[PDB]
């Protein structure tokens, strides 16, 4: 390169670092130790837009720029030390480094796939996970060997391209014709596997150096801004030489459009007079290959909504998710719902159940529950799930954490997953002889499931004809209106409402408390659904219903909806009556039904002081 170019580049970086990076260098100067290591973080877009010439000089030879910036940082530190007013609690350090970040979003610099052979000497950005990890080891850099046959000492260095080997020199750079270890560094070796979510992918062997050692973990998402170079091997006569692709790291990250919003507020601002029309439209687009079955489709959305985790200070943490289980005669559509819900959720694992061994349901290696962190694992054929395995999940289903010390290793892992289940009612189902009798599951397990919906096929002469016409005429989506919704829109909708944190209110909790106190003993209090875990779920479902309607303040409507749904969930013994889930259709007008439901609920449980306020609010809208 030209002599003036590097000088101008160094001037640019030193000016930028002196203008925008005084606090960090001041902090770095005021530290103990003399010569260990100290990095500096510098953004790229700002200095790229400050001068147009630096970018062209940078993104063609990404080797000299780092050294020039290191020299600029050194001279800046020297200048600051010279112009210092408190030279007592300060120390001068000879080891500085550079770390650039904030690369543009150009398609050819944010490539997700590993380059084949075309990117050598190009600055790239890759993302992926971690598989293997080596040990901390120390290299030798430079020797300063004894001077032979001459006087001036030699400062020969090592070469990276030859696996850190040393070549014996014989031609001295001496002016005349006469021609004849307290240094340490750091090292590591890591393997990166490309993610499958955004895609079998191959592996990238990344090499770390200096401070980057002991800064990565197995099983985390990484983003490295490194250079791509080639590593050779010693040559053998009359064979095929071997090469490899590596990635020298220069920076690391531990990371783990207004149009979509504007569309969402347009949608939930148009539906202002009628708030339940939006909810009806949301529920209709779920699994639109099935006719009817309002309650189950609402329950699936409520379960998939989620909740918030609330951990106490010292040791304890409570559950913040929900679980669902369905029972019914074969041929009702249980598998369709699981298949459809296995796709909307970003991360989901589909398993057979009885065909899955103990290596998946628990830890062995990662199984199924641990592998589905922050996701949803679907469970099928729960009738005979290998009773040992069927009972060895009580710990991880309620405490969200496994605690195993098999073979004297003492390993602890985290698992937070919503479980969906569907099993056949072995034996001819009866209206009486509650689920604990027909399916014969233990009471401790038949308490952690929030909603248990029962499906029964009975004698009717209308639903059969409607479903026969639906199947035969091939009338996909009988509502020919072009509202629908695409699957990507639903995925974005359910991936965006997970960020809101609703807060409880006073017109709310009183209703749930009175309902729980009333239900704790009416005349039979069932046998297993009247424990303390009932109220712990009545809040998690009422809160989840509030995150599907774009708000963060629970009101009377959410409480009424959740109470009605959960009361309908409890088959047989109840306080209003049981309604079959399958024989339910979308109401033509939801406002009148909501008003009737509120008037029916708020009379026998004495909260009449709220009914007047609610009717006044409903009238004035």
């Amino acid at each position: 390169m030209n002599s003036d170019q590097v000088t101008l580049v160094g001037q640019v970086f030193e000016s930028y670092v002196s203008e925008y990076h005084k606090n960090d260098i001041l902090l770095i100067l005021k530290e103990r130790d003399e010569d260990a290591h100290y990095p500096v973080v510098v953004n790229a877009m700002t200095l790229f837009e400050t001068n147009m010439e630096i970018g062209e000089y940078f993104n063609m030879f990404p080797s000299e720029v780092l050294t020039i910036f290191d020299s600029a940082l050194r001279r800046s530190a020297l200048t600051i030390l010279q112009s210092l007013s408190q030279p007592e609690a300060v120390s001068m350090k000879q080891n500085l480094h550079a770390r650039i970040s904030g690369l543009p979003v150009c398609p050819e610099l944010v490539r997700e796939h590993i380059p084949k052979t075309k990117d050598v000497g190009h600055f790239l950005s890759v993302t992926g996970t971690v598989i293997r990890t080596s040990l901390v080891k120390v290299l030798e850099f430079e020797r300063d060997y004894m001077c032979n046959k001459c006087k001036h000492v030699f400062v020969i260095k090592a070469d990276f391209e030859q696996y850190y080997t040393f070549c014996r020199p014989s031609s001295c750079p001496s002016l005349e014709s006469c021609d004849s270890p307290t240094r340490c560094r750091d090292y590591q070796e890591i393997k990166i596997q490309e993610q499958v979510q955004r895609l079998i992918p191959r592996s990238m062997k990344v090499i770390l150096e200096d401070d980057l050692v002991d800064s990565c973990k197995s099983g985390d998402d990484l983003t490295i801004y490194g250079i791509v170079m080639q590593r050779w091997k010693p040559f053998q006569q009359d064979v095929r030489c071997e090469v490899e692709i590596v990635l020298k790291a220069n920076y690391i990250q531990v990371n783990n459009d207004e149009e979509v919003q504007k569309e969402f507020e347009d949608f939930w601002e148009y539906y202002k007079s009628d708030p339940f029309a939006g909810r009806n439209v949301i529920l209709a687009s779920l699994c639109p290959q099935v006719f009817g079955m309002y309650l189950v489709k609402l329950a699936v959305a409520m379960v998939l909504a989620g909740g918030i985790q609330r951990t106490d200070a010292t040791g304890t943490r409570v559950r913040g998710e929900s679980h669902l289980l369905l029972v019914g005669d074969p041929g009702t559509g249980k598998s369709q719902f699981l298949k459809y819900a296995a796709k909307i959720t970003p991360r989901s694992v589909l398993t057979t159940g009885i065909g899955s061994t103990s290596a998946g349901l628990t830890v062995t290696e990662a199984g199924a529950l641990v592998l589905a962190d922050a996701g949803l694992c679907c469970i099928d054929q729960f009738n005979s799930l290998k009773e040992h395995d069927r009972t060895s999940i009580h710990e991880a289903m309620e405490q969200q954490t496994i605690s195993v010390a098999k073979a004297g290793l003492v390993c602890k892992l985290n698992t937070r997953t919503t479980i969906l289940a569907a099993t056949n009612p072995k034996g001819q189902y009866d209206p009486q002889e509650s689920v604990s009798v027909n399916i014969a599951l233990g009471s401790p397990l038949l308490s952690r499931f929030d909603l248990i919906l029962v499906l029964l096929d009975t004698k009717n002469e209308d639903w059969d004809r409607i479903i026969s016409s639906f199947i035969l005429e091939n009338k996909g989506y009988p509502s020919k209106s072009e509202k629908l919704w695409s699957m990507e829109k639903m995925k974005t909708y359910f991936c965006l409402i997970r960020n809101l944190q609703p807060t409880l209110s006073d017109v709310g909790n009183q209703v749930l408390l009175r309902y729980y106190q009333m239900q704790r003993q009416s005349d039979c209090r069932n046998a297993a659904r009247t424990t303390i875990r009932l109220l712990e779920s009545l809040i998690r479902l009422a809160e989840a219903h509030a995150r599907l309607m774009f708000r963060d303040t629970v009101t009377l409507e959410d409480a009424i909806t959740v109470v009605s749904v959960m009361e309908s969930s409890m088959q047989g013994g109840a306080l209003l009556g049981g309604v079959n889930a399958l024989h339910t259709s979308f109401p033509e007008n939801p406002g009148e039904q909501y008003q009737r439901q509120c008037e029916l609920i708020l009379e026998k449980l004495e909260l009449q002081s709220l009914l007047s306020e609610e009717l006044r609010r409903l009238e004035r809208l």
Partner: protein, 602 residues
């Protein structure tokens, strides 16, 4: 002064106007010059590839007019004839770019030559010694795709004394030394490596294994077909997935150091992706031309067995199959389009050869017993179901299984199978048409009991199957006489009589070899669909079936039967090579259905 600027990159020889290749150069350059206005400039500029079709060369153009020795020259000389394509392409592109620039410099890179559509298919089992360095063509599948690793071909060397470094064309990745250097003058040597200069060039690499199909020569020996390796050079790779049907043309070379002991491998030159002869078509039209096609195909599956018309009709219906529904493409959730038939009856009725013949007449089949296989055998551990993809995987001795019953409900219904190691994704398709035959629990089935206790089957696995035929053995008089006469002679209107053969006529069966080629044509050129007239009959049947059997005791009737009736009505539209649904078409699937349903429970 040389018109061809890229001479150094191409052939490495001193330029002299005496080689015979010059005439070929002008012939090929003229051929490319006339036919130039059909190729996208950007694709050739980026990825060097000219997909020259051999038919155009064979068409008798100036390529053959100027020189008639083109096929012989191509076969005998692998590289001399091949690189003339690259020479002509480079020259024509560079002159076109020069003309365009002058009207309103040029550093175009290397362009490879691609010659495909090679007509004489020299299949395997014939390449041992003679086919050395001779251009041939192959055909097979891919099973052993491997990883990538770069290699170097023109890495540079250091120079002695003065400068003037050089870029020796190292051959096929074998390290060598420049015992002489051209340079201006003086001695050579300069034996030092300089593997950092941009003179060094690298390219990708791959390795593929090919297993050759069934083809012909159905020898009883269990010798696996021979396999030959493949090597992809440049701009290729990631063009294949485990399991395909590919045609590969390339030079045949000999490897080393698997010591004068070597093997055989092929360097690829062109890859394609994805056939019936004219005589096969003529035969299938004559087969379609028959006046009674259903009788001829139902009474030719197995002529040894006498009687049992309906079971053979059901097997014939199962062999063809139905249609696959991809409704609501954004989410689909596809539904399977093949039936499943179980045969249960007393021993000695012959329910073990109607299945052997059905397995024989199939594009892809497999026969497995019910005692030598476990859960790890039927499912993936490559299980039997995977090997029977797009075919039939008939299983014998079904009743005796007692532990693998709950292992195939997911596989047959989900239309897919996942990994059996803790269920950690890695799913593979498995399309099967499982056919099973079994005997009652107590040997002979008595006539005064309940049906449920005589099968030892739950309500889950008994409802998946579309048809469960029940056969009885009763001591008649006429039937036994006729059967005895037939079984000794071998050693020397409802839809039940129109198919029976009245003695005194010839019903000469079609050979199974010809019938095998018929199913393959049927299953990939006709997609039947239901008509408005036929759906009414099925709906009416379902309506009186449900309302009648919802009170009586029988297997519960779900919505699965409505889909099964549609599937079977679609099935009786690919046997006759039609795309409709006539009223008789739906009426013929009612009488057959009344042989495991109501017509039998009594």
């Amino acid at each position: 002064f040389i018109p061809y600027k890229g001479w150094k990159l191409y052939f490495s020889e001193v330029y002299s106007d005496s080689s015979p290749l010059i005439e070929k150069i002008q012939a090929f350059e003229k051929f490319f010059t006339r036919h130039i206005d059909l190729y996208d400039k950007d694709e050739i500029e980026r990825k060097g590839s000219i997909l020259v079709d051999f038919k155009e060369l064979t068409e008798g153009g100036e390529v053959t007019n100027l020189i008639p020795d083109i096929a012989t020259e191509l076969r005998d000389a692998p590289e001399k004839t091949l690189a003339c394509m690259g020479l002509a392409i480079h020259q024509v592109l560079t002159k076109d770019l020069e003309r365009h620039a002058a009207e309103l410099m040029v550093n175009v890179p290397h362009i490879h030559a691609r010659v495909y559509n090679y007509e004489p298919l020299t299949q395997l089992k014939n390449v041992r010694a003679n086919y050395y360095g001779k251009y041939i063509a192959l055909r097979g599948t891919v099973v052993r795709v491997s990883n990538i690793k770069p290699l170097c071909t023109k890495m540079a060397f250091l120079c002695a004394a003065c400068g003037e470094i050089q870029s020796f064309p190292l051959p096929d990745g074998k390290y060598s030394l420049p015992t002489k250097c051209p340079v201006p003058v003086c001695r050579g040597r300069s034996f030092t490596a300089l593997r950092s200069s941009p003179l060094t060039v690298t390219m990708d690499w791959q390795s593929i294994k090919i297993q050759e199909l069934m083809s012909d020569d159905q020898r009883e020996a269990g010798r696996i077909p021979r396999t030959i390796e493949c090597e992809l050079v440049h701009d290729l790779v990631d063009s294949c997935v485990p399991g395909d049907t590919v045609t590969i043309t390339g030079i045949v070379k000999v490897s080393n150091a698997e010591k004068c002991m070597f093997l055989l491998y092929i360097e690829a030159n062109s890859i394609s992706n994805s056939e019936f002869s004219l005589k096969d078509l003529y035969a299938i039209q004559e087969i379609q031309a028959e006046e009674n096609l259903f009788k001829l195909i139902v009474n030719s599956l197995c002529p040894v067995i006498f009687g049992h018309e309906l079971v053979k009709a059901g097997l014939a219906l199962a062999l063809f199959g139905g249609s696959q529904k991809y409704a609501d493409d954004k989410n689909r959730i596809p539904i399977r389009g093949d039936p499943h038939i179980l045969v249960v009856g007393d021993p000695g009725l012959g329910k073990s050869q109607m299945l052997q013949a059905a397995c024989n007449v199939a594009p892809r089949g497999v026969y497995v017993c019910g005692n030598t296989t476990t859960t790890s055998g039927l499912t993936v551990t490559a299980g039997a179901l995977v090997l029977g993809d797009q075919g039939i995987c008939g299983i014998d001795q079904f009743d005796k299984m007692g532990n693998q019953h709950q292992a195939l409900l997911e596989a047959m219904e989900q239309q897919s199978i996942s990994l059996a190691k803790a269920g950690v994704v890695c799913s593979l398709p498995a399309r099967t048409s499982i056919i099973a035959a079994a005997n009652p629990v107590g040997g002979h089935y008595n006539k005064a009991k309940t049906v449920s206790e005589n099968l030892k089957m739950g309500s889950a696995l008994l409802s998946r199957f579309d048809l469960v035929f029940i056969l009885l053995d009763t001591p008649n008089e006429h039937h036994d006489h006729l059967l005895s006469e037939h079984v000794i002679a071998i050693r020397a209107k409802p839809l039940s009589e129109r198919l029976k053969v009245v003695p005194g006529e010839t019903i000469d069966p079609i050979p199974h070899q010809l019938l095998r080629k018929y199913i393959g044509y049927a299953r990939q050129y006709v997609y039947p669909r239901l008509s408005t007239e036929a759906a009414r009959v099925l709906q009416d049947f379902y309506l009186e079936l449900r309302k009648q059997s919802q009170r009586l005791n029988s297997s519960p009737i779900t919505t699965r039967q409505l889909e099964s009736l549609i599937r079977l009505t679609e099935a009786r539209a690919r046997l006759e090579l039609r795309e409709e649904a006539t009223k008789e078409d739906a009426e013929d699937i009612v009488e057959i259905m009344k042989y495991s349903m109501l017509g039998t429970y009594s």
